[PDB]
Design a protein around this ligand. Sequence first.
Ligand SMILES: *C(C)[C@H]1/C(=C/c2[nH]c(/C=C3N=C(/C=C4\NC(=O)C(C=C)=C4C)C(C)=C\3CCC(=O)O)c(CCC(=O)O)c2C)NC(=O)[C@@H]1C
Ligand SMILES: *[C@H](C)[C@H]1/C(=C/c2[nH]c(/C=C3N=C(/C=C4\NC(=O)C(C=C)=C4C)C(C)=C\3CCC(=O)O)c(CCC(=O)O)c2C)NC(=O)[C@@H]1C
Lengths: 459, 508, 40
Amino acid sequence: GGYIQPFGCMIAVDESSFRIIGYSENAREMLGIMGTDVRSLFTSSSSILLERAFVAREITLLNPVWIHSKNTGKPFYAILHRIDVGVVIDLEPARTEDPALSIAGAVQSQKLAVRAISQLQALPGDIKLLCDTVVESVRDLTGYDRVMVHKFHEDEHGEVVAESKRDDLEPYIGLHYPATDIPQASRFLFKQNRVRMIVDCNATPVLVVQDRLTQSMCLVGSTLRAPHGCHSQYMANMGSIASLAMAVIINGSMRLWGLVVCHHTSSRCIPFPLRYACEFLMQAFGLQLNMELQLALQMSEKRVLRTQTLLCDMLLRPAGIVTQSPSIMDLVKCDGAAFLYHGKYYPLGVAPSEVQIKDVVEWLLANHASTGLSTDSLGDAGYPGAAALGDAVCGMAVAYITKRDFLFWFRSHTAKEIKWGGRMHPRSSFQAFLEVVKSRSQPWETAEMDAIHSLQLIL
Amino acid sequence: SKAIQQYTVDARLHAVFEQSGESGKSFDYSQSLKTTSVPEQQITAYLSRIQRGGYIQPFGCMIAVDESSFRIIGYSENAREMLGLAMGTDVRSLFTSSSSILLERAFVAREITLLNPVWIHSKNTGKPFYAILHRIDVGVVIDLEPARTEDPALSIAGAVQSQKLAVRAISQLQALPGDIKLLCDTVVESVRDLTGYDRVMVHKFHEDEHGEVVAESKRDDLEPYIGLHYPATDIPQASRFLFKQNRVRMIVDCNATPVLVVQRLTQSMCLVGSTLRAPHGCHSQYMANMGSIASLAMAVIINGSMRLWGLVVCHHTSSRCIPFPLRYACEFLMQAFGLQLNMELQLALQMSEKRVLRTQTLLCDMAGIVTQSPSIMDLVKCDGAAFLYKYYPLGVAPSEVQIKDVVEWLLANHASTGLSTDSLGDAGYPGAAALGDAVCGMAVAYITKRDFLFWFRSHTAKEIKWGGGQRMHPRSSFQAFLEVVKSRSQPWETAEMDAIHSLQLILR
Amino acid sequence: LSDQEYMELVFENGQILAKGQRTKSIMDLYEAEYNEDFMK
Ligand SMILES: *C(C)[C@H]1/C(=C/c2[nH]c(/C=C3N=C(/C=C4\NC(=O)C(C=C)=C4C)C(C)=C\3CCC(=O)O)c(CCC(=O)O)c2C)NC(=O)[C@@H]1C
Ligand SMILES: *[C@H](C)[C@H]1/C(=C/c2[nH]c(/C=C3N=C(/C=C4\NC(=O)C(C=C)=C4C)C(C)=C\3CCC(=O)O)c(CCC(=O)O)c2C)NC(=O)[C@@H]1C
């Protein structure tokens, strides 16, 4: 069996007969204590609560169960989930032994969530402000030494887009890392239980003993699951001894937009009420973020349509499209652009020389002789050159207008706009990412190709 | 604005109701609305009565404590009854040691309290209470709402189940097709399942501040209300203001006997921060007439600086008192609904702008603006339109002679680059009667000394349908509303006038 | 985060107006207040 973090216990019992299938090694010590009835290890009301949880059609509705051990009477929070052959309960000790304080905390787990979400309501089309507000709220609730918002990109590589740290620590905003740092399995696991918590990396994992059993049960859904070899040492290097990642889920069938990752320089365990306050705040944050993304898409469509209308007005009033304040560099987020017309070359911004464009159009007529390619790396696309262009002109989007008249949008390598100052470690990840996109521009988004095609089809 | 003017009307109606009660007579809703400046004393008295009152609902205790030495400075008459006590004694002696200490901690904290509400136990009986504290300009108010004598695990389980049901409702909300009506229906069903009330409705406040029932979920025995429009005065502005602070308003039993609040002090205590605040007499009469014995209302606040877009109203045909955690869950679900609704409204505005832009372009390309598919009537929401050069009728429009007379009146009294009226009679057109209610509202755009663009719209009730007045009852409210809008059409929005003037400029 | 403060409508002058009545983190507040020493 796998391993679990030593701050909690796990007991796996048969769904029907309520007998022990398996258990973590430390369970017997933590409870004050194979194949035996589980209900004899707790008080009676606890046993009826457990039976109600088991019989429930959707066990998730009764997850955080308040239970008392029969041998000590101390309270535990149980969380239940059905693996494929039974049920598993993760037991975390509760700090408060007072029923009054317990009820007060359970109620203010909701009160704090509502209070925090009120601030999100207060904000007036600005994802940056939203992310900073969320980070500040989460740092106030949790008290971690660092909180950041990682956004995942179309290429599945992440960027730290917001942060809130101590004064003594170093900033990470603007840091990019390759997608391989977060395995795809974990990204899948974040559409499952949406909160990962690591209390202390430098902690001996505890073995899960299983009974005469078939293929070992999967702990992929448990919350006490120990961290893996990569990430434990990666964190030890990074200088973070505790962590708490919370998924940001939006619509897209649901998709993962990013994470809210918190780091602490020492072992830390957040109480349940604040944990659930954070969970509810995350739900609200994802909702608002999804709506913001939709509205941003609509506004971008509006802007592109107006730009295209002006360009059409001029184009019907040839070359003048590339001579006025509005120009072909306004449809797309491009470092440069160019227009070939009757053999005349009209470059704007970072564009290659005339002979270079003649060579590239000859190459196009040789290999892609069509309507127009679009690549984030000219050298990789099959262009024999791309060394004379250095890092100034890397990605190209082409639109064929005639047999000799063409439109080009040029984009420089994806390190020009990346600004961050400064073994498994963030610096190594940044250098690896820079190697990955070497001479590679940003992807030409689908909407941008739609705009280019709209301009093309009307000329 | 009309919202600020409505305070005088509220004061007048409140005075009329008080007079009718004094004389022992009935309250004549129809004539009260028909016949209704005001001295500052009357408005001050109205606001003090609503917000100072003196009575609470008899489903809990209220105690006011002075922050110094914890001395009582006022309490409801039933406080002793539940706490199985005199003005100027120690509140900490009523409860047990642990509860007293937790209350001291709730007192000490500043700018935020994590012991609020507090689970306390009375000294003499051990009865569990939820103590809810807040600050008033003379001390603190403690609302004691009784609790159920169950094991702590069961209270925690109830709170957990309420939380999870709210979470499921929000998950269903987010995972919806891109339609405000579907959102309203979904939230109506979710809230009805969560709470357990016999009826749930969504009220939308219009530009005139008058309400409307846009969604509803009821048991099959009750009469439906979806589709009803009632005048703005049914909800006084003081309550709407209070709704942006107390997002959840609960009335347990409209037929219960209010309890007097016993109270050095110069003025009556303020109860706007208390949930035990009993309702006014005439809303209790309204509820009795409707047949609703309980009620629960939740505010739909959207960012517009927060606006009250509307309300979600729950009704039960008998007394009903839900616990506090379920009220928290309802508030959370309402916050999610408000966020979604705000963003839906913004998206709808953007789509409307897009559609109007496409229509304007098509019209500019190609009087062809009438004798073609995307004609002028598509520019704005109207029941008809016309272009006067010769006259080109289209849709519900006045005859050539009627429009000729309208133009003569426009020249006589306005000479002006545009008109936007929702009632020709209110404007003062002599021939409005000859148009009946087909042509009530008119928008006119000037093209030149002789060319005009007309957009005609008919009376509001044309698009208002519901299955149904001296007594205060929903039928009386609907009849009064229909009385208000007689020769008046729907109001021309700002966006519609922007589009009208855009086309005017482009044509000229 | 902070506690809710309530505002009372008044009719002052010739206008209606609403008249009114931290360094530690929420975790530190929770630890400070939900503490069980006072029960020996
Ligand atoms: C191992 C050779 C590879 C790898 C594996 C790996 N990664 C995760 C999950 C995470 N790693 C993250 C990455 C970062 N954390 C940071 O602080 C920064 C930058 C400042 C980076 C780049 C993130 C995000 C996570 C979240 C997981 C979490 O628990 O918080 C895992 C999951 C293991 C587990 O026990 O859950 C694994 C095995 N990471 C590498 O660097 C290389 C490529
Ligand atoms: C009394 C003389 C005047 C008045 C006062 C009044 N109105 C309210 C609040 C509400 N009235 C509502 C009206 C309706 N409720 C319904 O279900 C329907 C059905 C279509 C109608 C027309 C609504 C809604 C409310 C809010 C509900 C809530 O829970 O508050 C109040 C509020 C008092 C309070 O204590 O909350 C008062 C004092 N109503 C009149 O008609 C006259 C003019």
